[PDB]
C-alpha cells in the first residue's frame, strides 16, 4: 500500500517509534475520567519542562492542526489596539500576517528574502516604534531559516512587547528556553518533532500569556483559550479531544525523558542534519538557508526542477522529501531531519540522488 | 493499563474494529500526494452515498472535533440578517444556541423539556414567522431524543428555511436521507457511529449549502469553508489534516460498504439498542426518551445516583457507560449502542447492574 514501506524525510507527518505506533492500535478510551485527567496533567508537566517554561506557566492541548492554535493565539492575545511586528521570511510568517489581517490586528510585516537571516541591526530598525507584540516562526520551515530567540526576546523586553513564538518545527529540534528568551507564548504541533500523528497542537503560556488570555473578549467557541485553560485545571478539555493522539503524545514525552530529555533530542536531530549535509557535498545542490535549523534543510537543485525530484523519489525510490509551493515550487525542496530516522536513512536518500544523477535527471 | 480491557458503552470514543485499529499502528504517510488525494475523494464519495445527499453535493473533512464543524457551519451559513429557529432539548441544541449568541445570529430557541419529543403541532407554532434557517441535533445525544427530519424538512421547505442537521450521533445509527428530507447541511464526527478515533469531523453540503458557503464573508482562517471546499476539489485540505484518522475512516467506510451499506449499519445498531432495552425490564430503571434513537438509550435510575453507577462500573466492573452533566448528573445516565459491540456485551453490562443490585447499590 502507498503508506507502507516509505522513507519519510518530510516535516510532518514523520516516522514514529514502534511504541507510539503500538498505542495507535489500542482501543481509544473514554476520557471524562480521573485516569485520562492524570495523563493530561502529565502531558502538560512534560511540555512545560521541555519548553523550559517559567514557573507559573500553563499548557493547553488543542484538537486541531497547528494553524488552528496560531489562530487561537492571535484571537485571544491581540486586539485592534495592538501593533504587532510580524517576522515574514516565508510561508508561516506570512500565515501570521494573514491572521492579523483577518482578525483586524494592526501589524507591520518585516519581510526577509527567502532564506535570509534576521540580523540584530535589522530588527532594531523597529526599536522604539510603539509596537506592542511580535509574532515569529522560530524555524521558518518553508525556507529552513532559524531565528535567534534570545536576540528577539531582548528586543521585545526592551520594548515591552508581548512575544509569541511558533515553535512548530523548532521545538525539540533547536535549542529553545522559554524562561531565558522571555517568550510569552509557544505553539507546537503533534506531527513535527513529537513525531505523533497530526491532529493535536499545543499552546504553552507563560504567566503573562495566561494573564493576557484571561483578559480576552473573543467571539469564538472552539478557540476560546479561557475555556481551554479552565478545563485543563482538572486535566480535561471543553469538547472531545483527539484522545488517541494525546495517549501517543504521553508515550512520546516519556520516551524523550528516557533518552535524556529535550537537550538530548535537540542533539540527536542536530547530528541527523549534519550527517545529511556532509553527504551531499558532491551533488548539484546549494543550501538555501543563511541560518540553518536542525529540523530541516532547504536545497536548491542547480540542474533540475525541485518538484520533479520530489515526484521521482516518491514514485520510483520509496522516498518522500518535502516539496515547496508557490514561487519556490520549481527551485527549492526540503529534507527533514525529524522523526524516527537514522544516519543510514540519509545514505539511502543520497544514493537515490546519485542514481538520479546517473539517469541524467540531475 | 486503564485503556486496556474495558467495555465501552459511551457515545464517543467507542470500540473500533480490528482492521481500523491495525491502520492506527501504521506509519502516517506524507499527504500532499495524488495517492492521498485519491483516498480523500473516495472518502467524500462514500460520505455522500451514506448521507443520501442530492446530486451536486460536496463534503469536507475538518481536523477538529464535531463542535468545531458546528461552529464553522454557523459562521459560514448565517449572518446578522438571518433569523434562526434552534431546537433545544438538551446540551447539543443548547450548544447551537450558544453559537448563535457568540456569532450574533438572531435566533429563537424552541425549548423542550429533557426527554420530550418534538410534535408537528409544536413545530408549526413557528410557521409563517419569517425564520430563515433552522438548527437541529437529529439525535439530541444528551437525552437520547430523536427528531423527525422528514417532518422538520417539510416545515423548512414550506417556510423557505435553510435546514442544518447535526447528525453526529444519528448518522449511520438512525435513518437519515438528506435528499428526501431536504437538509442543506449535515455534520458528523469521526468518534461516533464511524467508530474511528476522535479528531475529524465532516460537513456535507447540498447544492444550496455549497451556494450559501460560497457567498459567505467570514472572518476566520481555520473555519473558512470556502477554502475547505476549494482544496477538496483535488482531494486535499488547506492545512495538515488528521491523516491517520482519515485513513481509518476510509477503511471504515469500506467496511460499511462490505456489510451492506448505510441501511445495514442502521439496522445493526437498531438491534443492539432493542437487545439492551429488552434486557433491563426487571431493573429499577426508567427510560427517559419519548422518541428513542437507535444510537443511545437514556436511563433514569429510580433507586440510585446515576453518576455513582458510572463510577462503580468504571472502577469495579471494567465498563464505561456514558454519564451526564449539569442538572442531569445525578438523575440520568446513558448506554450507547454504537461501535464494535455485540448483544453479548449487553448481557455483560446487565449482569453488572444485577450485581450492583445484589450489593444494594441499586
CATH of the domain at A33: 3.40.640.10
Domain boundary among B279, B301, B325: B279
Q: Which domain-ending residue is among B262, B279, B296? A: B279
d(CA A75, CA B221): 11
The residue whose grid cell reads 518553508 is A142
* A31 and A142 together in one domain: yes
Tell me which residue has cell 497530526: A198
Q: How far is B238 from chain A (nearest CA, A)?
A: 10
**B214 CA to chain A: closest CA distance, Å?**
17
Residues A8 and A125 in one domain: no
Q: Residues, chain A, total?
A: 362
Give the helix, strand, coil percentages of chain B, each rounded to 5.
40, 15, 40
B222/B238 Cα distance (integer angstroms):
8
Question: Which residue in chain B has the smallest CA separation from A15?
Answer: B27
Q: Which residue of B has its CA nearest to A243?
A: B198
Residues B261, B247: Cα–Cα separation, whole Å: 19
Residue B327 DSSP class: G
Distance of alpha carbon A358 from alpha carbon A60, whole angstroms? 50
Contact B28 A10 (CB under 8 A): no
Alpha carbon distances (Å) from B268 to A199, B35, B172: 30, 33, 10
A310, closest residue in chain B (CA to CA): B33
Q: Are both B309 and B319 inside the same structural domain?
A: yes
Find the Cα–Cα–Cα–Cα dihedral A100, A102, A105, A108, rounded to 10°.
40
Give chain A's domain count: 2
Query: Are B163 and B286 within one domain?
Result: no
Q: Do the Cβ atoms of B237 and A198 come closer than 8 Å?
A: no
Min Cα–Cα distance to chain B from A169, Å: 13
Q: Do A30 and B244 touch (CB under 8 A)?
A: no
CB B328 within 8 Å of CB B154: no
Whether A326 and A214 map to the same domain: the answer is: no
How far, rounded to the nearest angstrom, does the alpha carbon of residue A224 sit from its chain's CA centroid?
22
State the DSSP code for B29.
P
Note whether B29 contacts A2, CB cutoff 8 Å: yes
Distance CA B357, CA B114 (A): 27
Are residues A13 and B239, on separate chains, in Cβ contact within 8 Å? no
- Residues 6 or more apart whose CB falls under 8 angstroms from that of A233 comprise none
CA distance from start to end of chain A:
28
Any idea what the CATH number is for the domain that residue A356 is in? 3.90.1150.10
Verify that A295 and A192 share a domain, yes or no: no
Find the residue in B nearest to A30 (Cα). Answer: B13
Same domain, B169 and B311: no
Is B136 in contact with B93 (CB distance < 8 Å)? Answer: yes
Same domain, yes or no, for B266 and B304? Answer: no
Hey, is B140 helix, strand or coil? strand
Q: Which residue range forms the structural domain that includes residue A285?
A: 1-13+280-362
The resolution, in Å, is 1.7
Optimal mutation site among B222, B223, B247, B311, interface A, most CBs of chain A within 10 A = B222
Cell triple for B63: 481536523
3-class DSSP state for residue B319?
strand
SS3 assignment, position B109? strand
Experimental method: X-ray
Tell whether the torsion through CA atoms of A166, A172, A174 and A176 is positive or negative.
positive
**Which member of B4, B71, B242 has the closest CB to residue A242?**
B242
Cell of B71: 461552529
Q: Which of B35, B239, B242 sits opposite A2 (nearest CB)?
A: B35
Compute the distance between CA of residue B140 and CA of residue B168 in angstroms, rounded to an integer.
Answer: 9
The secondary structure of chain A, three-state, reads CCCCCCEEECCCCCCCCHHHHHHHCCCCCCCCCHHHHHHHHHHHHHHHHHHCCCCCCEEEEECCCHHHHHHHHHHHHCCCCCCEEEEECCHHHHHHHHHHHHCCCCEEEEECCCCCCCCHHHHHHHCCCCCCEEEEECEECCCCEECCHHHHHHHHHHCCCEEEEECCCCCCCCCCCHHHHCCCEEEEECCCCCCCCCCCEEEEECHHHHHHHHCCCCCCCCCCHHHHHHHHCCCCCCCCCCHHHHHHHHHHHHHHHHCCHHHHHHHHHHHHHHHHHHHCCCCCEEECCCCEECCEEEEEECCCCHHHHHHHHHHHCCEEEEECCHHHCCCCEEEECCCCCCHHHHHHHHHHHHHHHHCCCC
- Tell me how far apart the terminal alpha carbons of chain B are, to the nearest angstrom: 28
Residue among B120, B70, B95 nearest B291 (CA) = B120
CB contact under 8 A, B199 and A4: no
Rg of chain A over all Cα atoms, to the nearest angstrom: 20
Q: Do B102 and A6 touch (CB under 8 A)?
A: no
In angstroms, the CA B301 to CA B288 distance is 10
Residues A240 and A361 in one domain: no
Is the preceding peptide bond at A173 cis, omega within 30 degrees of 0?
Answer: no
Q: What are the phi and psi torsion angles at A123 (to 5°)?
A: -60, -40
**C-beta separation of B29 from B36 below 8 A:** yes
**Co-location of A39 and A183 in the same domain:** yes
- Of A255, A279, A303, the one marking the end of a domain is A279
- Considering only CB atoms, B2 lies closest to which of A35, A102, A241, namely A35
Residues B109, B200: one domain? yes
Shared-domain flag, residues B215 and B126: yes
Amino acid at each position: 500500500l502507498y503508506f507502507q514501506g516509505m522513507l519519510n524525510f518530510t516535516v510532518g507527518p514523520v516516522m514514529s517509534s514502534e511504541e507510539v505506533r503500538a498505542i495507535g492500535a489500542e482501543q481509544v478510551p473514554y476520557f471524562r475520567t480521573t485516569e485520562f485527567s492524570s495523563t493530561m496533567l502529565e502531558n502538560e508537566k512534560f511540555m512545560l519542562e521541555y519548553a523550559k517554561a517559567p514557573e507559573g506557566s500553563k499548557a493547553v492541548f488543542m484538537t486541531c492542526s497547528s494553524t488552528g492554535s496560531m489562530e487561537a493565539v492571535v484571537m485571544n492575545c491581540f486586539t485592534k489596539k495592538d501593533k504587532v511586528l510580524v517576522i515574514d521570511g516565508g510561508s508561516f510568517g506570512h500565515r501570521f500576517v494573514q491572521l492579523c489581517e483577518i482578525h483586524e490586528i494592526p501589524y507591520v510585516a518585516l519581510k526577509l528574502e527567502h532564506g535570509k537571516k534576521l540580523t540584530k541591526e535589522k530588527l532594531y530598525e523597529y526599536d522604539n516604534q510603539n509596537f506592542t507584540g511580535l509574532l515569529v516562526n522560530v524555524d521558518e520551515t518553508s525556507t529552513a531559516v532559524l531565528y535567534d530567540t534570545m536576540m528577539i526576546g531582548e528586543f521585545c523586553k526592551k520594548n515591552n512587547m508581548f512575544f509569541v513564538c511558533d515553535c512548530v518545527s523548532a521545538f525539540l529540534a533547536d535549542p529553545f528556553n522559554m524562561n531565558e528568551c522571555g517568550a510569552d507564548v509557544m505553539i507546537t504541533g503533534s506531527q513535527k518533532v513529537l513525531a505523533c500523528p497530526p491532529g493535536i497542537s499545543v499552546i504553552v503560556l507563560a504567566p503573562r500569556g495566561v494573564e493576557r488570555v484571561e483578559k480576552s473578549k473573543v467571539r469564538t467557541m472552539y478557540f476560546d483559550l479561557k475555556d481551554a485553560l479552565k478545563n485543563q485545571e482538572r486535566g480535561q478539555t471543553p469538547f472531545t479531544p483527539a484522545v488517541g493522539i494525546l495517549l501517543q503524545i504521553n508515550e512520546r514525552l516519556k520516551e524523550i525523558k528516557k533518552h535524556g530529555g529535550a537537550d538530548a533530542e535537540v542533539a540527536r536531530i542536530a547530528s541527523q542534519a549534519a550527517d545529511f549535509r556532509a553527504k551531499i557535498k558532491d551533488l548539484p545542490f546549494e543550501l538555501v538557508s543563511e541560518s540553518p535549523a536542525n529540523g530541516v534543510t532547504s536545497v536548491h537543485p542547480t540542474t533540475a526542477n525541485a518538484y520533479d525530484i520530489f515526484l521521482k523519489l516518491k514514485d520510483e525510490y520509496g522516498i518522500w522529501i518535502c516539496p515547496n509551493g508557490g514561487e519556490m515550487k520549481d527551485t527549492i525542496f526540503r529534507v527533514g531531519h525529524i522523526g524516527a530516522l537514522t544516519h543510514e536513512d540519509n545514505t539511502t536518500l543520497v544514493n537515490a540522488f546519485k542514481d538520479l544523477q546517473k539517469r541524467n535527471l540531475l
